[PDB]
Structure to design on (1101 residues):
């Protein structure tokens, strides 16, 4: 790739109580990353209908409070299986093929941006995304990219009558006859709170930052160490809040692919490749995404009082190699290999290893 | 997949003591599937000569009894390494690159239908199925599909001469100069009985079933839980025997592809995809196979008194989501969300949950 | 593959303090094996500047003595992380992404040959070899195949300024303002003795060999049982020394590709495929590389006094299946079945089983 561009969605699907936005998974960034991105927003009383995908999915909630519930095959009911609550900041984990449903109850919408790792090992189909809905007669979000009905409507009435042991009339209602997101007139009176596994860990409205710098921002990461349902996914996530003109240092992921989606405000990012080319040099704003491939190096300087972002890294234990600051790779170098690979005096080399005391987040220059 | 079809073979190879038939790997079903199917039948006194593929193999024995022996490199002998017996319903696990031979001695022929997963992490070559014979001049079963002799008959007359430490004459014998299934005139007088790992497990008719229902039939599953050599393969198999007009309810496999080879009888099968499209609506009869991709939904009604099948799943521990039955996905949903995704009333949603009290097999409708 | 051949390199770069050669990764043999070979060389007082790749690397030192550093991300300093010394006959293991530098102080020019497994599961990018130089203005070894400056020079002056917290005078030095391998004029004052695990193991002649035949030679191999860091790499290596006219028997790797680099001398190798076609017959001589795929079979007779080779296998625990020897597959086959596959008398079967008593190495034929 010669030029990474900030990408917008190219597909909106307005449902009765919501909206689904999907990004084109065949632009070379998304081809390379091997994920498909989606932003679902569901209004008051909306109930996203039960569905599943042929790959690992990890959902980040940008705003809202609802209930969500996953129908796991080998699992015990309570009537019905476990319903979890959520808040903005929560990272939801969805194992391959597991069917889920989500519902909102307040005025403030649920906006939940999320990625499908189409390129996962668990995805024994092809690199195309697919959602398999259990209900309704509607085009699945990604059918456009391939080139409607639920997985139950593609059956024969005689087959559905026999399977459920119900009469023809009710069997007709299963068989199709509002989109994926439906509005509940009366609102669900369904109780507000591996089958044992926690699949909800908050990296937004926390107060326990991985890194926290009162002069520059704060950053948090959910890896499997602290959110073990993520070893199932082999997926990760980072949330970082950045003050105006603070910066996160040049770094690269050794073992992963970052899909940086910007939640708030804006920042000027720079990403340079193996040949030293500056494959993107611009600004990333709200509701826009930048994919940063594996060993490529990104550096950002903020433009807003708090430029927030969720970076979905594809690896449940991602590793970053900081190139400037407290724990950098140049710090860990002998003071004389730096002198000869950079062509620096002994005096200077020291400054390049100690002028910035800060780990990852470096404060605003002050001018 | 546009349309799935009940595939038969496109390759008969008749040898002295038996027959090998293979199914085309370049068909779109097998290409998605990632498998290579084949069915070898050995007659009385026949010896399938030692060979090996570059991927995980899983052999099911449709009928007959005989013996088979692995030639595992890191092992102790006795004279010779271990030879095992086999009955019908035996599932033999063969690790990547291990060699083996199989012999029959009855009048009843061994019919062993098997799959090589050519899309394995273990297969480090290409998607093309191939078999490497130690002995005998003959072309390999999948030479047909690429576009001969065995591996030993390719070296120089003096390289075997030098290697085995023998003369020109028996070097010419080892050097090639009846195909893969030769008949052993008198009979192999070898006694009828990881190195220690049990590569045999009976899933067939002489088993203790997983689902059993005397009005509808029974299912039996060999995951890696119960047959531990299968976690080496990363392959599974399943046996079913449905009563006439009994059905297995619509279900999908969360994490595996299935290759349903029908062993006995006939059945009316139906599979639907992500867009509610009925990709197969027909009959799978004996000696035919139907590939059901990853999150595709499958349901079948039996048309025989006892329709029997083998289902090679491609995952050593497959999970199936049942869409109807005691433990269905719909059974674990809140009654109220079942009303709102399918447009039912409370009463009807009491029925989709409770009209069928059965797990996986549902009895004949009984009219 | 139709035919194989002994390959010499196509690309060579003269750097100030040494040289770098790279084999073309887009040959059909290299696309099949899935690896990229480079042979670098450090003359005296040379530093190889910090670099890193999107894949698991395994460097084998052919000749010389020197030291090297590995800049691991999480790892603790000492002033800087822990340095290791290498001497010839060594194998150094470099995890995906880890940056490393390499120095030479003797006159004796360090020659190391190495692979990058671009087909790894850690390699999330594509099938391209690509080195990320941490400093200096030079075009990367592999760029040519793709068709410069470092990851630091592509960045902006003020981004580098603010990043490192420096003055603009040393930020411009730092911004790249003598190639990969640069001569330290005085030569480093730096000493000569997962953050603590061993990443060096010696498989040269100094080592205790696995096989030692005083008339034939010796074979030493490092798996992840004896060099555990290689389980990270999912790679291994194997050194071989063979007297004139001796032979390593016909054999096949069950689970790995093989990259034979001819260190010293010249032998005559034969590799035959699954059809019986001798896809290579002729001589692999010094500084040349023969790729030998997964279940393909190889035999070789040494034509020099002591032909020396390193075999880069693509598996940390490769299993080999030898075709003639003490330990052979034929040995484990009952005398009777080996009579019938090869068409031999009983007494001619015992000759195959017993004449050659040596494991892997068979002496000269004695003429």
């Amino acid at each position: 790739i010669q030029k990474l561009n900030a990408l917008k969605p190219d597909n909106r699907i307005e449902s009765e109580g919501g909206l689904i936005e999907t990004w084109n998974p065949n632009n070379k960034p998304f081809q390379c990353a091997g994920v498909a991105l989606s932003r679902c927003t569901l209004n008051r009383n909306a109930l996203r209908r039960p569905s599943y995908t042929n790959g690992p999915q990890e959902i980040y909630i940008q705003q809202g409070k609802g209930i969500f519930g996953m129908i796991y095959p080998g699992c015990p009911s309570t009537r019905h299986q476990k319903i979890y609550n959520f808040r903005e900041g929560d990272l939801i984990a969805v194992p391959t093929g597991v069917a889920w449903w989500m519902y909102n109850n307040e005025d403030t919408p649920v906006v939940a941006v999320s990625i499908i790792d189409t390129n996962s090992l668990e995805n024994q189909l092809d690199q195309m995304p697919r959602r398999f809905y259990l209900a309704g007669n509607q085009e699945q979000e990604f059918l456009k990219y391939q080139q409607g009905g639920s997985i139950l409507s593609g059956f024969t009435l005689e087959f559905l009558e026999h399977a459920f042991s119900v009469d023809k009339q009710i069997a007709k209602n299963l068989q199709g006859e509002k989109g994926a997101i439906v509005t509940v007139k009366g609102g669900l009176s369904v109780i507000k709170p591996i089958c044992t596994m926690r699949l909800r860990h908050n990296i937004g409205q926390t107060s326990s930052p991985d890194i926290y710098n009162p002069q520059a921002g704060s950053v948090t990461t959910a890896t499997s160490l602290d959110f073990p349902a993520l070893s199932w996914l082999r997926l990760s996530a980072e949330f970082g809040s950045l003050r105006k003109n603070a910066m996160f240092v040049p770094h690269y992921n050794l073992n992963a692919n970052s899909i940086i989606y910007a939640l708030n405000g804006r920042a000027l990012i720079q990403v340079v490749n193996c040949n030293g080319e500056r494959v993107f040099d611009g600004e990333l704003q709200e509701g826009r995404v930048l994919i940063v491939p594996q060993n490529f190096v990104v550096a950002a300087r903020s433009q807003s009082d708090n430029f927030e972002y969720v970076s979905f890294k594809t690896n449940d234990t991602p590793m970053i190699g900081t190139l400037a600051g407290a724990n950098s790779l140049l710090n860990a170098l002998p003071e004389e290999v730096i002198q000869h690979t950079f062509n620096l005096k002994s005096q200077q080399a020291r400054q390049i290893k100690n002028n910035n005391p800060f780990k990852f987040l470096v404060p605003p220059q002050e001018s």
